[PDB]
Amino acid sequence: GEKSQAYAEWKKALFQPADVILDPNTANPILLVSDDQRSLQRADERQNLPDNPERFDWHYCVLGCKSFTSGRHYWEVEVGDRKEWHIGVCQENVERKCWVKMTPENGFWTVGLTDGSKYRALSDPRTKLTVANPPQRVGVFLDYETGEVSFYNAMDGSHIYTFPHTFFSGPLWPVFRILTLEPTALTICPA
Amino acid sequence: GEKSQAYAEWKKALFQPADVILDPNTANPILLVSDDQRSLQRADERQNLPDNPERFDWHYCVLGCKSFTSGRHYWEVEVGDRKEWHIGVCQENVERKCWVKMTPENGFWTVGLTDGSKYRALSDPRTKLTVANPPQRVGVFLDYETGEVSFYNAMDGSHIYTFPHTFFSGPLWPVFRILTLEPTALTICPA
């Protein structure tokens, strides 16, 4: 398809493919990280984990294993028919233990889905998205220098959302959040 | 402040600022192009102007005086409170005389406003946009090499719309369309 091909070529012209794996030491104790570190599920209740300082205690979040301090990066996430998910990037210095709202002001740039059909950007206030075809696979695109975080339907190349250009402070991490206990996992596409 | 600053730094970092002036020779006869070639209004009825080959005779369109065959470019348009307008880029080879639907397949990449409140991308089908803050000034962003046409609120840096990445055929011209008679002109911001 021409739109698929143009999407493939744009990613190659401009963005380094990140090979993102989930860091289980950061995962909220209700999350399960797969042994291959590409997939995420949710437990029925908090499991017994050591509360190391990096772990998200409150928000159902996990980070990637590598951060970005510069340049243009993308990765793709198989959200499949999940009813609920949010993905994007967050600053190294985000609050991990106490509650904070997951907003750019607090160092989170994420978009996703609630209740099967409600797409939102987690701006403050939240941005209601209108998405013609529900994505099965989402591309996350970072340009550190221009402060750009944008999201695409990775199967048809359609744009989902771009946050206002911002100024990042410190390293950015891929972040993933699931609130629900449902059959479809969240899975990272390898580079 | 930071949103405006980051928007300014991004467009300066990556996009060549276009100084766009309207070509009255291309303008549908119902259009009025200002003396300084920055502003566009509609007449009550078609003026008696020659149907030279470059003039749009069907769509209420006018082009800029320079095309893009390479590079990244931007320009901003003061739409103010005008209840109807569509802006973007089109191919040099668009149908100017006969009815065609303004779509990417027909060589037009445009977004805008109908009846005061209905924002759309003129994709096929049309994309209903949700815009929480109605723009007064719209930034038009072209990247020829990656087939990218995107639109921003130029006052607060908030994203409006990005077409799917495509493959461009030949030169791209700034294009402007107004259907209605109303008090507020469209005005191009100088570079």
Residue numbers in the entry:
A (entry chain A), B (entry chain B): 323 to 513
Question: What is written in the article reporting this PDB entry?
Answer:
Vγ9Vδ2 T cells—a major subtype of human circulating γδ T cells—respond to multiple cancers and infectious diseases in an MHC-independent manner; they are specifically activated by small, non-peptidic diphosphate metabolites called pAgs. The sensing of pAgs in target cells requires a surface protein, BTN3A112–17, that has both intracellular and extracellular domains. Here we show how—in both humans and alpaca—multiple pAgs function as ‘molecular glues’ to promote heteromeric association between the intracellular domains of BTN3A1 and the structurally similar butyrophilin BTN2A1. The BTN3A1–pAg complex functions as a composite interface that directly binds to BTN2A1, bridged by the pAg molecule at the centre of the interface.
